[PDB]
Design an enzyme around this catalytic site. Structure first.
Site, mmCIF file in Angstrom:
data_model
loop_
_atom_site.group_PDB
_atom_site.id
_atom_site.type_symbol
_atom_site.label_atom_id
_atom_site.label_comp_id
_atom_site.label_asym_id
_atom_site.label_seq_id
_atom_site.Cartn_x
_atom_site.Cartn_y
_atom_site.Cartn_z
ATOM 1 N N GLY A 10 42.645 23.306 35.930
ATOM 2 C CA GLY A 10 43.890 22.578 35.454
ATOM 3 C C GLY A 10 44.945 23.322 34.823
ATOM 4 N N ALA A 11 44.939 24.516 34.501
ATOM 5 C CA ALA A 11 45.795 25.359 34.174
ATOM 6 C C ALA A 11 46.760 26.002 35.305
ATOM 7 C CB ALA A 11 45.242 26.458 33.532
ATOM 8 N N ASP A 44 47.608 41.837 34.828
ATOM 9 C CA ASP A 44 46.355 42.008 35.222
ATOM 10 C C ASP A 44 45.665 43.274 34.609
ATOM 11 O OD1 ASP A 44 44.037 41.022 37.304
ATOM 12 O OD2 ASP A 44 44.243 43.404 37.584
ATOM 13 N N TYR A 49 39.859 50.138 33.262
ATOM 14 C CA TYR A 49 41.286 50.942 33.277
ATOM 15 C C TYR A 49 41.479 51.763 32.059
ATOM 16 C CZ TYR A 49 41.848 47.522 37.134
ATOM 17 O OH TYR A 49 41.474 46.546 38.239
ATOM 18 N N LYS A 78 38.741 41.614 33.071
ATOM 19 C CA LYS A 78 37.645 41.659 33.716
ATOM 20 C C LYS A 78 36.582 42.340 33.039
ATOM 21 C CE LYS A 78 40.797 42.951 37.656
ATOM 22 N NZ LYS A 78 41.656 43.535 37.032
ATOM 23 N N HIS A 111 34.301 41.765 37.387
ATOM 24 C CA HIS A 111 35.288 42.747 38.016
ATOM 25 C C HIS A 111 34.385 43.039 39.475
ATOM 26 C CE1 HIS A 111 38.011 46.378 37.159
ATOM 27 N NE2 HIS A 111 37.958 45.941 38.497
HETATM 28 N N1 LIG Z 1 39.683 43.648 40.928
HETATM 29 C C1 LIG Z 1 39.858 45.024 41.462
HETATM 30 O O1 LIG Z 1 38.678 45.436 41.770
HETATM 31 C C2 LIG Z 1 41.007 45.653 41.609
HETATM 32 C C3 LIG Z 1 42.267 45.163 40.900
HETATM 33 N N2 LIG Z 1 43.433 45.862 41.294
HETATM 34 C C4 LIG Z 1 44.651 45.312 40.392
HETATM 35 O O2 LIG Z 1 45.651 45.299 41.357
HETATM 36 C C5 LIG Z 1 46.512 46.353 40.777
HETATM 37 C C6 LIG Z 1 47.648 46.649 42.037
HETATM 38 O O3 LIG Z 1 46.913 47.561 43.006
HETATM 39 P P1 LIG Z 1 46.908 49.083 42.914
HETATM 40 O O4 LIG Z 1 45.745 49.492 43.668
HETATM 41 O O5 LIG Z 1 47.420 49.590 41.636
HETATM 42 O O6 LIG Z 1 48.105 49.521 43.949
HETATM 43 P P2 LIG Z 1 49.634 48.871 44.418
HETATM 44 O O7 LIG Z 1 49.220 48.486 45.834
HETATM 45 O O8 LIG Z 1 49.947 47.776 43.372
HETATM 46 O O9 LIG Z 1 50.207 50.103 44.430
HETATM 47 C C7 LIG Z 1 50.916 50.855 43.257
HETATM 48 C C8 LIG Z 1 51.628 52.014 43.515
HETATM 49 O O10 LIG Z 1 52.735 51.679 44.173
HETATM 50 C C9 LIG Z 1 53.887 52.312 43.701
HETATM 51 N N3 LIG Z 1 55.093 51.134 43.854
HETATM 52 C C10 LIG Z 1 55.263 50.162 43.042
HETATM 53 N N4 LIG Z 1 56.113 49.325 43.277
HETATM 54 C C11 LIG Z 1 56.958 49.996 44.305
HETATM 55 C C12 LIG Z 1 57.788 50.061 45.073
HETATM 56 N N5 LIG Z 1 58.916 49.075 44.525
HETATM 57 N N6 LIG Z 1 58.469 50.829 45.751
HETATM 58 C C13 LIG Z 1 57.654 52.047 45.889
HETATM 59 N N7 LIG Z 1 56.423 52.357 45.353
HETATM 60 C C14 LIG Z 1 55.877 51.226 44.318
HETATM 61 C C15 LIG Z 1 53.598 52.506 42.262
HETATM 62 O O11 LIG Z 1 54.167 53.665 41.667
HETATM 63 P P3 LIG Z 1 54.737 53.831 40.182
HETATM 64 O O12 LIG Z 1 53.755 52.962 39.369
HETATM 65 O O13 LIG Z 1 54.848 55.317 40.241
HETATM 66 O O14 LIG Z 1 56.141 53.094 40.289
HETATM 67 C C16 LIG Z 1 51.978 52.866 42.569
HETATM 68 O O15 LIG Z 1 51.813 54.292 42.969
HETATM 69 C C17 LIG Z 1 46.017 47.226 39.951
HETATM 70 O O16 LIG Z 1 46.951 47.896 39.249
HETATM 71 C C18 LIG Z 1 45.234 46.296 39.240
HETATM 72 O O17 LIG Z 1 45.657 45.463 38.138
HETATM 73 C C19 LIG Z 1 43.330 46.940 41.869
HETATM 74 C C20 LIG Z 1 42.149 47.318 42.579
HETATM 75 C C21 LIG Z 1 41.032 46.851 42.330
HETATM 76 O O1 LIG Z 2 37.719 48.440 40.178
HETATM 77 C C1 LIG Z 2 39.044 48.735 40.322
HETATM 78 O O2 LIG Z 2 39.704 47.754 39.531
HETATM 79 C C2 LIG Z 2 39.955 49.713 40.612
HETATM 80 O O3 LIG Z 2 39.383 50.987 40.802
HETATM 81 C C3 LIG Z 2 38.599 51.756 39.821
HETATM 82 C C4 LIG Z 2 39.422 51.572 38.607
HETATM 83 C C5 LIG Z 2 38.771 52.293 37.535
HETATM 84 F F1 LIG Z 2 39.360 52.293 36.221
HETATM 85 C C6 LIG Z 2 37.519 53.057 37.679
HETATM 86 C C7 LIG Z 2 36.772 53.012 39.001
HETATM 87 C C8 LIG Z 2 37.500 52.358 39.874
HETATM 88 C C9 LIG Z 2 36.880 52.493 41.324
HETATM 89 S S1 LIG Z 2 36.243 53.832 41.805
HETATM 90 N N1 LIG Z 2 36.797 51.171 41.836
HETATM 91 C C10 LIG Z 2 36.127 51.061 43.113
HETATM 92 C C11 LIG Z 2 34.654 50.369 43.068
HETATM 93 C C12 LIG Z 2 34.075 50.353 41.872
HETATM 94 C C13 LIG Z 2 32.938 49.668 41.800
HETATM 95 C C14 LIG Z 2 32.252 49.069 42.861
HETATM 96 BR BR1 LIG Z 2 30.782 48.302 42.716
HETATM 97 C C15 LIG Z 2 32.953 49.441 44.203
HETATM 98 C C16 LIG Z 2 34.163 49.981 44.050
HETATM 99 F F2 LIG Z 2 34.738 49.998 45.409
#
Ligand SMILES: NC(=O)C1=CN([C@@H]2O[C@H](COP(=O)(O)OP(=O)(O)OC[C@H]3O[C@@H](n4cnc5c(N)ncnc54)[C@H](OP(=O)(O)O)[C@@H]3O)[C@@H](O)[C@H]2O)C=CC1
Ligand SMILES: O=C(O)COc1cc(F)ccc1C(=S)NCc1ccc(Br)cc1F
Length: 313
Positions: A10-11, A44, A49, A78, A111
């Site tokens: 609902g949010a 996020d 992290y 997470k 997560h």
């Molecule tokens: N649930 C999960 O398991 C995971 C969650 N996540 C979440 O998703 C978020 C986003 O994914 P993430 O893997 O960080 O990567 P992104 O795909 O968001 O890419 C981030 C990178 O892109 C660069 N960048 C950002 N904006 C621009 C732009 N306008 N032009 C050029 N380069 C740009 C950043 O550089 P800079 O910062 O130097 O500007 C950084 O190096 C994470 O930070 C996290 O919060 C990600 C992975 C796993």
């Molecule tokens: O995980 C994130 O959000 C972003 O990535 C990370 C962010 C961190 F702060 C530390 C490790 C990871 C890694 S290595 N994540 C990948 C990963 C972790 C656990 C398992 Br199950 C599978 C897998 F693919």
């Protein structure tokens, strides 16, 4: 485009948020302050992290400044894999709350589906480098998440990196009290996720796309890996729309009814990535971007692939 999507609790959730993985602790407070100043209302986060205290400093300052009200923010964190135990979930959530300077989270995610042995190490390994599992399953972890809703610590609960069968398990849980609101998964033109997205959407679960820019700062990047931001086919779509490639990559999931969470610590880019509500990709653009799928993942991890609940193949 409308800025928020309705969740099954609902949010409403802002469709664009700021990612914080890899944001250095000495930079992320300013990043979040800038983000809030330029319009972001969704951050996020995650305990793993290692920067939630610094994210929290920014949130608290902007609340104290009255730049925003708490009700207008949507803060996500997470539960890390080493806290998949009945007796650890609440404390893990409370540590995140304490670090973020909050009395509730808008959304708290499992997560990864895999539980690991509790302890100080985020990735406990055996002497041969395999992660050490916990015996606790996703259903019992989900029940623990449901308790957090019932205690007022979190307004919504969800999952992340759950595959189709794992989402289904959750939905088919005996005695399920709250459905997952969100499944947060990797999604971008090289990993378009059509199957998992359609399943989740069909069940009313909102999908958040992580690594929408292909995570160029991922620590395991290799020079030969594909690069979304440098793909001339994507650059051409951007040029046609007089937008940046990043802006196209952010708008793409938005038009798929996804939430998207690009990360930046660069103030100019934080602003650039928000300026995605005044242009539309055509259906042909959308289908063209989808055509770039190659099943390529940023987020995978060899040490965890034998865990019974590892999500990917
Ligand atoms: N649930 C999960 O398991 C995971 C969650 N996540 C979440 O998703 C978020 C986003 O994914 P993430 O893997 O960080 O990567 P992104 O795909 O968001 O890419 C981030 C990178 O892109 C660069 N960048 C950002 N904006 C621009 C732009 N306008 N032009 C050029 N380069 C740009 C950043 O550089 P800079 O910062 O130097 O500007 C950084 O190096 C994470 O930070 C996290 O919060 C990600 C992975 C796993
Ligand atoms: O995980 C994130 O959000 C972003 O990535 C990370 C962010 C961190 F702060 C530390 C490790 C990871 C890694 S290595 N994540 C990948 C990963 C972790 C656990 C398992 Br199950 C599978 C897998 F693919």
């Amino acid at each position: 485009m409308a800025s928020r999507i309705l969740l099954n609790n609902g949010a409403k959730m802002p469709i664009l948020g700021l990612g914080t993985w890899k944001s250095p602790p000495g930079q992320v407070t300013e990043a979040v302050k800038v983000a809030i100043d330029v319009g972001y209302r969704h951050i996020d986060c995650a305990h793993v992290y290692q920067n939630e205290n610094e994210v929290g400093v920014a949130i608290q300052e902007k609340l104290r400044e009255q730049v925003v009200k708490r009700e207008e923010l949507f803060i996500v964190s997470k539960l890390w894999c080493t806290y998949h135990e009945k007796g650890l979930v609440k404390g893990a959530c409370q540590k995140t709350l304490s670090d973020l300077k909050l009395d509730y989270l808008d959304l708290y995610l499992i997560h990864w589906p895999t539980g690991f042995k509790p302890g100080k190490e985020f990735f406990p390994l055996d002497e041969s480098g395999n992660v050490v599992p916990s015996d606790t399953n996703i259903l019992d972890t989900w029940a623990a998440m449901e308790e957090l809703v019932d205690e007022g610590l979190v307004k919504a609960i969800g999952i992340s990196n759950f595959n189709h069968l794992q989402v289904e398990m959750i939905l088919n849980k005996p005695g399920l009290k709250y459905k997952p609101a969100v499944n947060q998964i990797e999604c971008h033109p090289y990993l378009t996720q059509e199957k998992l997205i359609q399943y989740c959407q069909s069940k009313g679960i909102v999908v958040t796309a992580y690594s929408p820019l292909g995570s160029p700062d991922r620590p395991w990047a290799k020079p030969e890996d594909p690069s979304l931001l440098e793909d001339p086919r994507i650059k051409a779509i951007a040029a046609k729309h007089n937008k940046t490639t990043a802006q196209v990559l952010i708008r793409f999931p938005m038009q798929r009814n996804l939430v998207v969470i690009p990360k930046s610590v660069t103030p100019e880019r934080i602003a650039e990535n928000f300026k995605v509500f005044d242009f539309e990709l055509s259906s042909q653009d959308m289908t063209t971007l989808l055509s770039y799928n190659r099943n390529w993942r940023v987020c995978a991890l060899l040490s965890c692939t034998s865990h019974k609940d590892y999500p990917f193949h």
